Design a protein around this ligand. Sequence first.
Ligand code: NAD
Ligand code: NAD
Ligand code: SSB
Ligand code: SSB
Ligand code: ZN
Ligand code: ZN
Ligand code: ZN
Ligand code: ZN
Lengths: 374, 374
Amino acid sequence: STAGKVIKCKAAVLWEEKKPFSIEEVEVAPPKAHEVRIKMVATGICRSDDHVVSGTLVTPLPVIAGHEAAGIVESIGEGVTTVRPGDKVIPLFTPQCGKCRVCKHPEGNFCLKNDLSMPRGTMQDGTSRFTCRGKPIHHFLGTSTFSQYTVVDEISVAKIDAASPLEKVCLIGCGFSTGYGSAVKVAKVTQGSTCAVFGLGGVGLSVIMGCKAAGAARIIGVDINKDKFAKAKEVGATECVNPQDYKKPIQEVLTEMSNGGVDFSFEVIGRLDTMVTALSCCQEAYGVSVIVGVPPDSQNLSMNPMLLLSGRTWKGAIFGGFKSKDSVPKLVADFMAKKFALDPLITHVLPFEKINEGFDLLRSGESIRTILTF
Amino acid sequence: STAGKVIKCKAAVLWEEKKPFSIEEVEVAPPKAHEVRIKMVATGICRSDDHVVSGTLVTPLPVIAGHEAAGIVESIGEGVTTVRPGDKVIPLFTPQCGKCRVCKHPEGNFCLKNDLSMPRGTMQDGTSRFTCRGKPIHHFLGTSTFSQYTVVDEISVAKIDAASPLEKVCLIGCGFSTGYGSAVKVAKVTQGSTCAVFGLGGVGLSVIMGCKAAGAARIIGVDINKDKFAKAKEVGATECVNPQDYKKPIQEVLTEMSNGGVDFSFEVIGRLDTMVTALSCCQEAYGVSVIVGVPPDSQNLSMNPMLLLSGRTWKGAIFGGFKSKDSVPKLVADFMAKKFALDPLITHVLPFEKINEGFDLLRSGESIRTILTF
Ligand SMILES: NC(=O)c1ccc[n+]([C@@H]2O[C@H](COP(=O)([O-])OP(=O)(O)OC[C@H]3O[C@@H](n4cnc5c(N)ncnc54)[C@H](O)[C@@H]3O)[C@@H](O)[C@H]2O)c1
Ligand SMILES: NC(=O)c1ccc[n+]([C@@H]2O[C@H](COP(=O)([O-])OP(=O)(O)OC[C@H]3O[C@@H](n4cnc5c(N)ncnc54)[C@H](O)[C@@H]3O)[C@@H](O)[C@H]2O)c1
Ligand SMILES: CCCC[C@H]1CC[S@](=O)C1
Ligand SMILES: CCCC[C@H]1CC[S@](=O)C1
Ligand SMILES: [Zn+2]
Ligand SMILES: [Zn+2]
Ligand SMILES: [Zn+2]
Ligand SMILES: [Zn+2]
């Protein structure tokens, strides 16, 4: 019905930094060869989309942000083989081309066709499928899910189970997969270990879930907002500490609580100072610390390399280290077999038109994940 | 016959920073409970001993430095069960008490009894066995090998093969084991990988040996002293580059040479800037960089945490990650079975009283390892 045609629909356009999204009419072009046009069903509000608004995460403006979603294929361009009209899909903000040296490496997932490193805000071919007010509008990470319809390259979409609940499994598109994979795949948390998770939002709670699934014995949640503790204990934290309650630096407290430093520590906030604190609190000879938080653009941290020379391992990852198009359909399969839960991450559900209210809920500290429905 | 008596002998005493060592008559007390007095046979001159002279490495002065050595047990204190008089031994600058949380961890080697983190320059009991004209002289790392005789705690000595050549296997007390273990145990270099090694002194050559033994296909040596290149190629370097030859930063050069970043990089110099360059030059999604060089005391490096968020892994180690008392004997056994060579590291051999000439050779760039013989 809309196949082959330009679609007029509503999208939340971000014209400038530090301004509310503008819900307006946009024009979405039909998919070109190897492209897929998706009707959005649900999308979650991740702190990284807020980072685009605050200027913490730099990408070309104006833009249609949103990267944690799920929808249904409206149409496909010529040559698409992996999805068909009517399929349920989750856009992949980290692509999986399958051909590059990273895609072919057993541990790499940061496909070289990404639009994260040197962001163009385009499709793979360097052009946009979005027009608003007569102007081209950038895409965001090959996804742009804050629109009733979006167009993505084939390497940036996965087909998922036909019966999945898209108002839940959109979290597999970012927050849950990132946290869970950061513990289970990137850190490789071991049975009986002690973990410290800095930041108890959606992604930090997912980290907790993966640490529990890996059989960690102690999982210490750290947050300056003590309203986050109850849910963190429900999904596995054995203790929670607020840095503001102590006179000494939290890395000291955590080192003492863990009788010399934790096995695995995770920075899931996005601050240079917690990145170093988190590295310091893991045991000096064999501790591992994983950076998951996105720090303010172009800013360097300062640290003493003696933290590493004693034996610590410091690493980071995007999307919990998962190869996105292989992993996402398996994650959905596992969710449908109830191998993990997504409901504890969802605190609020709102219609898409109330996106600004959804960002206010995140910014006030009140929500974990607001899911927006179209 | 000297058992249980004070031994008067010669040691090299460093009285203050940035002065030549001073060959002095010292008194070495007999070993107390669980202590081992050793007659030195051979000691190598490591760049970390030169860091005490330059103030790069801070430790209480005056001191008897030296930590890479081998010798023969002259006597043992009460309660010693792991060595006897006459045994060949290598002093361990990182102890292995076998009882702490690190010694029990499968991967940890930075025993909590070490005297590295907050150096006291004493025996484990907080006192010194060394006196020079009535003045107590500090120990260094519980070894102090620049002395005809030294005393060490039993957790800082290993028994080795009675047939081993001490003027070669002293290198297993530091340089060889550190470089080789950094490659084969800490980085876990893989078959067919590309490695970059920054610093082609004794420890960097040992890293190259380990990379070649691990099956690396390409091993790129990096040094500003091109006279180091021939010997690096003899032990496995497939290419060598001098950063001074280029009008662009070497991390860019190495990323182009490696078609987008190396698999494994090693900093084996001790500079903040080469630590960040070495991290940068490993592939951004799966590369691994290991810090091996010792940087200037109390100085922090500055780096962008996005280098880790893409996927890199950064780590460091002391002594190649080997649990020292367990691994030293097995490394000597492997040397005896011709599993690796130690002659390629040894460029000069001097009597002990020519220690300052040995350090001049290191500082001028002309030597790799000078072995001082007693
Ligand atoms: N690496 C990836 O692939 C990836 C994927 C998703 C999100 N992220 C990033 O991870 C971070 C967390 O995302 P989120 O959606 O869970 O965010 P969020 O805002 O819901 O949660 C962050 C938590 O940090 C806590 N916090 C703030 N300052 C703190 C401090 N000084 N100490 C301790 N806790 C503090 C807050 O109270 C909050 O609960 C963000 O920076 C986001 O951009 C990265
Ligand atoms: N982590 C440990 O357990 C351990 C053990 C032994 C040695 N170390 C440290 O390892 C480092 C190497 O020790 P070594 O005995 O081989 O020393 P070395 O001085 O023989 O070798 C250092 C090499 O660095 C090269 N170099 C210096 N500045 C450079 C620059 N800007 N760029 C490129 N190359 C440069 C020199 O020309 C030299 O060949 C030292 O810092 C030493 O303290 C650490
Ligand atoms: C600068 C790296 C940004 C990475 C974030 C992009 C959206 S997802 O939340 C991870
Ligand atoms: C402060 C770290 C020093 C580490 C070095 C001590 C002697 S060995 O060369 C490694
Ligand atoms: Zn996200
Ligand atoms: Zn790829
Ligand atoms: Zn050394
Ligand atoms: Zn120990």
